[PDB]
């Protein structure tokens with residue numbers, strides 16, 4: 468029974484009308500419907516989408532039993548629907564039991580809250596389905612937090628970790644954690660734009676605490692608008708849809724205050740021709756120094772409010788600035804004021820880019836027992852203090868953790884259960900090899916030794932996929 472692409476949303480709307488929380492998701496799908504339908508038709512012309520098996524897919528939304536996560540769920544469901552899969556949407560324990568009770572489930576999209584429910588509801592046979600799980604986890608899960616016993620040994624108290632999955636089963640909001648898979652979402656998209664209009668990113672007064680100098684510098688050159696705080700700020704209150712599309716289409720500069728971290732909104736601003744003023748974090752913010760991140764299953768350090776925007780887009784669309792550097796902020800605002808407007812969206816955040824990525828994952832990513840192909844492997848040695856993530860990135864590659872097993876001249880050697888191996892002491896030519904295959908980790912820098920690191924190429928604008936991965 469083969470998957471046939473769908474070009475009509477009538478059935479999708481009927482499914483999402485069964486859950487009150489999808490109300491504004493259905494609205495957004497209608498706004499984006501022509502983009503989605505154009506994209507599934509264009510993909511089907513570029514690539515053979517024939518002879519794909521129709522999968523029975525459980526989509527269990529633990530969080531419905533977070534706007535960015537609701538957007539990601541909406542875009543995932545829409546992608547599955549367009550690709551012709553048999554979607555069973557669950558937002559209750561009752562639904563979960565019924566769907567799994569019926570059997571034939573081939574693929575499971577769930578969040579970590581939903582996974583706790585899955586385990587509790589199904590009992591010990593929950594692990595029978597473990598290889599079919601794709602776990603929507605916005606901020607990502609590094610191997611040291613996923614391995615229950617290693618995490619306990621290191622004193623990690625995360626309520627989110629210790630699931631003992633293959634870490635590539637965690638599906639992230641941005642491609643920030645190469646131990647994981649990047650799922651993302653779709654970003655909704657010069658006489659319109661008011662050259663001197665800036666708009667503050669942040670719907671609560673709390674976000675604005677101790678930003679006055681920053682805002683005062685911006686206010687020297689631009690009107691400061693808000694949707695929520697100095698007297699001069701022009702507040703439009705809470706908005707949406709066409710209205711917010713208009714306000715962003717009207718705005719030259721979208722102003723970050725530091726929070727929230729890694730949201731969709733800066734990408735929507737850039738897609739609508741805005742530049743993003745992106746606060747720089749020195750030191751970088753992590754579960755080690757930031758209350759928001761304490762208990763999150765990663766030590767990943769954020770170098771700015773939106774590191775994807777900073778690293779994968781950059782100027783002129785994204786100015787990553789020290790808020791405390793008055794010279795730097797003024798230079799940035801004056802630059803943006805004089806910039807030519809260039810609306811931009813990375814391919815991977817388009818309808819067709821997301822359809823291509825999720826179709827590849829559905830067809831090629833299998834944890835139930837080779838992809839990416841071993842031809843993609845390029846091995847790099849991380850210097851001491853450098854992670855496998857870093858040394859791949861430094862060569863315009865990305866760490867590919869599925870190649871660690873193929874990397875596991877050595878005068879002596881030993882075995883260790885540690886996220887930092889395989890390692891090489893090139894002084895005494897001593898090799899330490901991985902003794903616990905669940906501890907293979909792109910994340911982590913050896914303090915003394917070189918790390919032996921598995922990298923792969925990526926399609927520019929589609930970092931989730933190697934050139935030979937389609």
Ligand SMILES: CC(=O)N[C@H]1[C@H](O[C@@H]2[C@@H](OC[C@H]3O[C@H](O)[C@@H](O)[C@@H](O[C@H]4O[C@H](CO)[C@@H](O)[C@H](O)[C@@H]4O[C@@H]4O[C@H](CO)[C@@H](O)[C@H](O)[C@H]4NC(C)=O)[C@@H]3O)O[C@H](CO)[C@@H](O)[C@@H]2O)O[C@H](CO)[C@@H](O)[C@@H]1O
Pocket residue numbers: 530533536578579580583584603604605606607627763764
């Ligand atoms: C959307 C999402 O999950 N996104 C990210 C996530 O982001 C964080 C997350 O926080 C969700 C939690 O927020 C509050 O702490 C609570 O509302 C909590 O709800 C549980 O706990 C409260 C009491 O604290 C209860 O009132 C509520 O019923 C619920 O109880 C819990 O129920 C579950 C289901 O059975 C049970 O399994 C738990 O044991 C039980 N917990 C307790 C202690 O009783 C929320 O869970 O979402 C926020 C926005 O919604 C974000 O800002 C947060 O950063 O982060 C993770 C990890 O990084 C990521 O994987 C995920 O994608």
Ligand SMILES: *[C@@H]1O[C@H](CO)[C@@H](O)[C@H](O)[C@H]1NC(C)=O
Pocket residue numbers: 663689690
């Ligand atoms: C910004 O420019 C527009 C037109 O160029 C004008 O209407 C507006 O008054 C200006 N704002 C400030 C604060 O000077």
